[PDB]
Design a protein around this ligand. Structure first.
Ligand SMILES: O=C(O)CCC(=O)C(=O)O
Ligand SMILES: O=C(O)CCC(=O)C(=O)O
Ligand SMILES: O=C(O)CCC(=O)C(=O)O
Ligand SMILES: O=C(O)CCC(=O)C(=O)O
Ligand SMILES: [Co+2]
Ligand SMILES: [Co+2]
Ligand SMILES: [Co+2]
Ligand SMILES: [Co+2]
Ligand SMILES: [Co+2]
Ligand SMILES: [Co+2]
Ligand SMILES: [Co+2]
Ligand SMILES: [Co+2]
Ligand SMILES: [Co+2]
Ligand SMILES: [Co+2]
Ligand SMILES: [Co+2]
Ligand SMILES: [Co+2]
Ligand SMILES: [Co+2]
Ligand SMILES: [Co+2]
Ligand SMILES: [Co+2]
Ligand SMILES: [Co+2]
Ligand SMILES: [Co+2]
Ligand SMILES: [Co+2]
Ligand SMILES: [Co+2]
Ligand SMILES: [Co+2]
Ligand SMILES: [Co+2]
Ligand SMILES: [Co+2]
Ligand SMILES: [Co+2]
Ligand SMILES: [Co+2]
Ligand SMILES: [Co+2]
Ligand SMILES: [Co+2]
Ligand SMILES: [Co+2]
Ligand SMILES: [Co+2]
Ligand SMILES: [Co+2]
Ligand SMILES: [Co+2]
Ligand SMILES: [Co+2]
Ligand SMILES: [Co+2]
Ligand SMILES: [Co+2]
Ligand SMILES: [Co+2]
Ligand SMILES: [Co+2]
Ligand SMILES: [Co+2]
Ligand SMILES: [Co+2]
Ligand SMILES: [Co+2]
Ligand SMILES: [Co+2]
Ligand SMILES: [Co+2]
Ligand SMILES: [Co+2]
Ligand SMILES: [Co+2]
Lengths: 247, 247, 247, 247
């Protein structure tokens, strides 16, 4: 690939990629960082295996992407209220979309994982949008969705940095399409979900100790796999803030 | 009701009505005819019980509504190729919509019917449209459907005489929504059909000898009931022509 | 028809019928009553037009069918707590199926109705069962449904008097199929409901003053039509009790 | 793991695994082979990376599993009519199920692959069955499916070697459930397919040169990913025969 400061091993031909040849415990210069971010924007989700960093180093790193909020809930490691831990989102979703302004991204970090199982699967909502017929794109271009646990977001959002359109709806937080009856709203959204969760649009992340991963919370969805029952899974994550999604 | 030359007994509060106090075998004057037609346009389907007319009288009558085509197929009574007889449309549909210009209306006439069973059920596609949320109306306003057995018609049509919008799609003749993929097209149309065939939008016509009925082939659908197996059902019908449906 | 003491005018070829030639204000002898009941069992729903009876006469009449319970809720005419009045069941259903022992039947009586609209539609759940393939009948023969507002009933019930099998489920009161997951339960029941609410299985009752109607609450469903907004509709009904439904 | 002659790196906690520490170009002894096969039966799909074998060696290897048929169609490398090549099954399916006796297994072998993309995804039909409620298992235990391009197979099959029950239906070859109407058959199968193609039941195989993979054609399904457009993908495969599937 066209990348001189980082090695870059794409996971599928649709999203996801792996990054090596960089010590995350050290500071990185503009041209190394310009590459890391240029990658994250093209692949949508990126991971860095065998990065034995510290929580302070975890924060700084996240901050490079954008301001570092705590999510209220979750339990932050006491000492680091920006760094929160993980040990129901086995339905595909993206995170905290009931917020006027949900997270741009999240950076996740493997502490103690199982040998196998406890994968995380992601999918591309650029792709989901992108595979709708021009006629269907037009038909729902201007619709809005009500997300809750309360707010409204557009059904198709433009990425603030990259300007690609991405379909934006998820079954965990989306009540209905504003202005439609429920029979109507249900009808569409179900189609749109059965369409986005196709296997062609997905990828699967294998979890290995001190791997550090970043996903774009606007233009992907993701889901936990429950195939580890019995085995300890302990990861941490910081949350980076984004503007209000828009069309 | 507000009707001085014809008695008028509405079947439901959504469509359909019954008309008496008029000898169909005689000619009718402007103000009697102005009423018959003013009714047909409000009720969408009308019937006239115990009208022992002749096929010539059947034609003239139809012609009052508009030019009288034969449908190729069907079998016309030999002697009257405009008058065709009846003895698969047990799915709801409207007639011959695969035509660049389908029938405006049809006039049907009971020769030998059963005592009961062999009803005909109709429904209102004004109502179907009318009960869609303003937001959903807008969402599909500008879509087109491909009808076959080949042509395109709009998904929402304006009535040429009355100017009411009416949803216009049917599962017997409609392949798909132009420009959409089949998974997409299927999704909508199924909703739209499951929505239009609601019981609230329907009515049911009881068939009795020398009853003469007229239905509006643009803004209704209709379906045969198969509950007469064993009993003779013989009706005739002329077909009145309409312009190309439009939005 | 084969009926010497009552005139009997079947509404469709699937269910429903009309009964005249009997003064309901008078007592009726075994052979007249033997006919009324022999009809109710074949047609599933029966009506008697222009019966200007009294509430006491309404009770006695109902009692001929079976014991006369009050439903708690509903509002009984004060003076007659067995006689309850009517002025959400616009979804098809049958009545009070959340009871260990729901009503066998109900007798309804028209006080002040509109000229048209405010029909009541019924359907046959004998027919619904009856049109399932032998293979599908077998597949769900032994299933149970959980009904609530709490109890279990079989999915296919045998009529206590007639011994015809009837499909027995309804979307207003049925939570799920016992033992199945919700994705599973949903799947079937939706099919079974989309199948039973077909138009071929239905009929529609026209409501006229002092008409008195009886429906079989085990083997039909029924639904109110909302096409009278603005017009006064006042009917009364007594409720006749039935055993626990069984297979 | 409990394996002394082969190294064994499970792909997910549901199916699939990777096998190293064995030169496939050499013969292997009972206890090494007893392990390879004991693995294939537990993981359902297995792969061997960086095995630069020959087509004769490819055949012998396959034969160890069972007799080696050609599939008519496909194009066999001229010189080896048992060894067939690959360069519509982007719907999930299993192979040639329209046969009275479909393939037990297939062995596939990577010649020239892309750097990334052109993955193959598999899923477990043990798991699919296994996650149905006991009540639903019972409900469809005894059903049959008609497969075509013509034959009948059971909807739930017992594995001839292992004796685990596995759900057995696929949307590419299955017409309908025998004895049911199409509305009925459609209803179930759609549920069963929407249920089996869940992400939790899947895995994804990364393709790398001279990797040799074996999948169990009775108890998995699999699907091609179209994310390589432009890049050369050339694999070969032999096909191993199985008895008629049974319950
Ligand atoms: O726990 C994981 O694997 C990530 C899944 C998730 O739902 C989240 O926190 O966004
Ligand atoms: O035969 C009838 O009852 C009318 C039904 C019909 O499909 C038609 O000719 O349009
Ligand atoms: O009010 C009616 O028309 C009868 C409908 C109904 O839901 C009932 O009381 O069972
Ligand atoms: O070509 C592949 O990736 C295997 C997919 C397939 O459909 C097959 O041959 O069974
Ligand atoms: Co390098
Ligand atoms: Co340093
Ligand atoms: Co690596
Ligand atoms: Co420290
Ligand atoms: Co900050
Ligand atoms: Co869940
Ligand atoms: Co707010
Ligand atoms: Co609501
Ligand atoms: Co689907
Ligand atoms: Co889904
Ligand atoms: Co008059
Ligand atoms: Co004259
Ligand atoms: Co009359
Ligand atoms: Co003559
Ligand atoms: Co003419
Ligand atoms: Co049909
Ligand atoms: Co043309
Ligand atoms: Co096509
Ligand atoms: Co529906
Ligand atoms: Co429906
Ligand atoms: Co329908
Ligand atoms: Co008499
Ligand atoms: Co007296
Ligand atoms: Co009468
Ligand atoms: Co009194
Ligand atoms: Co009593
Ligand atoms: Co309702
Ligand atoms: Co109880
Ligand atoms: Co539950
Ligand atoms: Co349907
Ligand atoms: Co329905
Ligand atoms: Co070893
Ligand atoms: Co050697
Ligand atoms: Co390896
Ligand atoms: Co050689
Ligand atoms: Co052989
Ligand atoms: Co395809
Ligand atoms: Co055969
Ligand atoms: Co067929
Ligand atoms: Co689904
Ligand atoms: Co799915
Ligand atoms: Co699917």
């Amino acid at each position: 690939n066209k990348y001189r400061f980082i090695d870059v091993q794409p996971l599928t031909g649709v999203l996801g990629a792996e990054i090596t040849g960089v010590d995350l415990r050290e500071p990185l210069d503009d041209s190394t960082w310009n590459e890391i971010l240029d990658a994250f924007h093209t692949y949508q989700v990126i991971y860095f295996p065998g990065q034995a960093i510290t929580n302070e180093q975890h924060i700084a790193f996240s901050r490079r992407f954008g301001p570092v909020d705590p999510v209220p809930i979750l339990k932050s490691i006491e000492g680091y209220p920006e760094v929160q831990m993980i040990r129901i989102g086995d339905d595909w979703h993206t995170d905290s979309t009931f917020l006027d302004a949900p997270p741009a991204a999240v950076v996740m970090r493997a502490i103690e994982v199982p040998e196998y199982g406890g994968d995380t699967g992601f999918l591309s909502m650029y792709s989901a949008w992108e595979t709708l017929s021009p006629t269907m794109q037009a038909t729902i271009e201007g619709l809005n969705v009500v997300h809750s646990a309360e707010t409204v977001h557009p059904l198709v959002v433009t990425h603030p940095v990259t300007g690609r359109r991405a379909l934006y709806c998820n079954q965990v937080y989306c009540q209905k399409i504003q202005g439609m009856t429920d029979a109507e709203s249900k009808s569409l959204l179900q189609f749109l979900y059965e369409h986005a969760t196709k296997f062609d649009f997905t990828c699967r992340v294998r979890w290995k100790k001190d791997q550090v991963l970043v996903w774009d919370n606007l233009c992907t969805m993701h889901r936990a796999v429950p195939d580890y029952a019995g085995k300890f899974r302990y990861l941490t994550r910081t949350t980076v803030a984004g503007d209000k999604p828009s069309r």
